[PDB]
Every structure is written in C-alpha cells, then in structure tokens.
C-alpha cells in the first residue's frame, strides 16, 4: 500500500523529467540582469556568487564556470550533464535551477539562494551531530537518492560541503557537476577522496551503488564528527578505503553500527541499496524505525536545528572568500564545445 503510492509518485515524476530531459531550457537570462554581491563559495572549475536580480529584487546563487578552464580539465561532458539534469529535476531536497546562460567566456547557472549555509560549516563547528539529528538528515538523502536513482541518475558527489541548510532546517543538495544519466556501468574517476567507493578507486566499472556507500560515509561523519577514512594525503585514504576495515566510535548505537557496516560493505553484491529490496532494505533498517518518510518528504517534521537568518540577502552563514572580478572576453571562447548549453 505505502510502496504502491511511492511507485506511482515516482512514475509520474519520470514522465515530467523526460519531458524536460528531451527539450532542455536555454538562454533564459543575461548577466546584465543581476548585481553581483558576494562569493559564497569556491569549487574546482568555477565559483558561486550571491547575486540580485535587478528586475524582481530576488537574490539567487549564481554558479560561474570558465569555458576555457572547463575545457583544460576535461569537464565538458560533465558540465553539459550538470546543467541538463538540473534543469530537468524537481524534488523538495534539490536546489532549483532558475536560469542558465552563457557568454564569450563563461557558463552561468542561477539557482535559488539557500541562506542557511553548508552543512559542513555547522558540523565542523558543533563537532558532531546527535544520532536523531543525523538520522533526520540522512532521511532526506535516502528519499533524494530514491528519486534520482529512479531516473537513471547517479549523483557521485555526496559530502557535507554539498548540502545546504534552508530556512526551515531542511537539506538542499547542490552541485550536480558529476551527476550522470546512465543505464548501465560507468567508469569515470571522479568524486571526493573521503567519499569514494572502493570500486571507483579500483577502476572496476560502477553503478548507483556508489551513492549508497557515500551515504554511509556521510552518516558516519555526521555522527562521529570525522569521516571513517581519513589521512593527510589522498593515496593513504584510498588504501584505507580499499582495505575494508572500519572502526566505530564507542558512542554509536548498535543499530547505527549495523546500518553502517551494511552500507560500508566493500562487496557491491552485499551492500545495502544494491540488493533485491533495493532502497527498501535501508528504509526498513531498525535505525530508521522511527522515521515517517512521508512526513519527511512532506516537511512536516520539526527540524532539530534552524540556522539564523537576519535578512534577505544575509550571507552570515557562509565563509568569506577573496573577490575576483568576472571578465567577459571580446572574443567568443569554445563556442562549438558548449553549443547545447
């Protein structure tokens, strides 16, 4: 009965997605229409800025990618994927893409602004989340992957730096830079060291299962306050990852340790989320016995924490970055490559 409503929901969702997937939105705004306020963050190929839309007065977060840099780092296909996918999705815990456009030097993606800041900031500050608090977040991730996976989508970049906290205390997943639509196996080496599944590190060809392993890492990190595999140099991390040995802090409940040992299962064929019951083995786990998935989806649950917002356009919850002026060349750069954007 509950399972059937989901299946239906999902079904209808696949239809809406396909419609956008086949005919993507394009050139919906222009740089001239916004005022650049402040850099909210930094990533590997571009930056994110707080911006204000002259005409409506709303603030948004604008992601900026430099065409040539994208090109030098071989991220063209990834960048087209990111945009094409973001424009097609629709789920309560995903950042909404508002506008997209390009110019001689860059690519722009404008989304709703999520003022609460990165989960990363708070976690590091607090040090660690109480189990129920972490379970609350994890729940949202579960449903999100449930949605995304059903669309043949693989996320590949889960980590607290990618989860923003909204006004209501809920999570918003951002950065679809490695998101891919694939029926079958994939082989690219991408992600964040601490969160990489062994198969990825082992160059074995992987599927949706890497997302579940990552969800395991995230939950451990939220509750312990440190990831399960840490070191100073990536190579050492990968070695610990591959090795298949996990230690848990004395404070984890027996339930949690059980969930975790099943998510952090080196053998894909035994890893929760990648079995006959698929997502159900997770949702059904004793650790989540308390969670009303529906209510979470509905956002009827009281968030355990609510970040402080002092006004629209308030950046208080974000770290400070050095400002770099955006420069638009007189010559069109890499036109061919980004035709579809």
């Amino acid at each position: 009965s509950e399972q059937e409503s989901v299946k239906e929901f999902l079904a209808k969702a696949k239809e809406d997605f396909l419609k956008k997937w086949e005919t993507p939105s394009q050139n919906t705004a222009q740089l001239d229409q916004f005022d650049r306020i402040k850099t909210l963050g930094t990533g590997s190929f571009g930056r994110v800025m707080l911006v204000k839309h002259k005409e409506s007065g709303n603030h948004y977060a604008m992601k900026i990618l430099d065409k040539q840099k994208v090109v030098k780092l071989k991220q063209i296909e990834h960048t087209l994927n990111e945009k094409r996918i973001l424009q097609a999705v629709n789920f309560p815990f995903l950042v909404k893409l508002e506008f997209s456009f390009k110019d001689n030097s860059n690519l722009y993606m404008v989304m709703e602004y999520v003022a609460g800041g990165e989960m990363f900031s708070h976690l590091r500050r607090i040090g660690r989340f109480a189990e129920p608090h972490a379970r609350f977040y994890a729940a949202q991730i579960v449903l999100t992957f449930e949605y995304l996976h059903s669309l043949d989508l693989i996320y590949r970049d889960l980590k607290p730096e990618n989860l923003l906290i909204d006004q209501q205390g809920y999570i918003q997943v951002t950065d679809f830079g490695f998101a891919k639509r694939v029926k079958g196996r994939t082989w690219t080496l991408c992600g964040t060291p601490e969160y990489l599944a062994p198969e990825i590190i082992l160059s074995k060809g992987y599927n949706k299962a890497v997302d579940w392993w990552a969800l395991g890492v995230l939950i451990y990190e939220m509750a312990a306050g440190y990831p399960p595999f840490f070191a100073d140099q990536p190579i050492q991390i990968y070695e610990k990852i591959v090795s298949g040995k996990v230690r848990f802090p004395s404070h984890f409940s027996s339930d949690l340790k059980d969930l975790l040992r099943n998510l952090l299962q080196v053998d894909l064929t035994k890893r929760f989320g990648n079995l006959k019951n698929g997502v159900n083995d997770i949702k059904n786990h004793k650790w989540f016995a308390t969670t009303d998935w529906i209510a979470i989806y509905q956002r009827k649950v009281e968030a355990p924490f609510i970040p402080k917002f002092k006004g629209p356009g308030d950046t208080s919850n974000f770290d400070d970055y050095e400002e770099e002026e955006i420069r638009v060349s007189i010559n069109e750069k890499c036109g061919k490559e980004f035709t579809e954007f």
Partner: peptide, 20 residues
C-alpha cells in the same frame, strides 16, 4: 583520541573533488 587526530590533520577544511 581519534577526533583529536582528525582535528590536527590536514583535511579538516573543505574537500575539493578530484577528476583526474
């Protein structure tokens, strides 16, 4: 403690993605 070990490690800040 492990936490203390993490705190002193070089990877307490924001972690960038790898691609290559």
């Amino acid at each position: 403690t492990t936490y203390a070990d993490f705190i002193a490690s070089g990877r307490t800040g924001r972690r960038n993605a790898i691609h290559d």
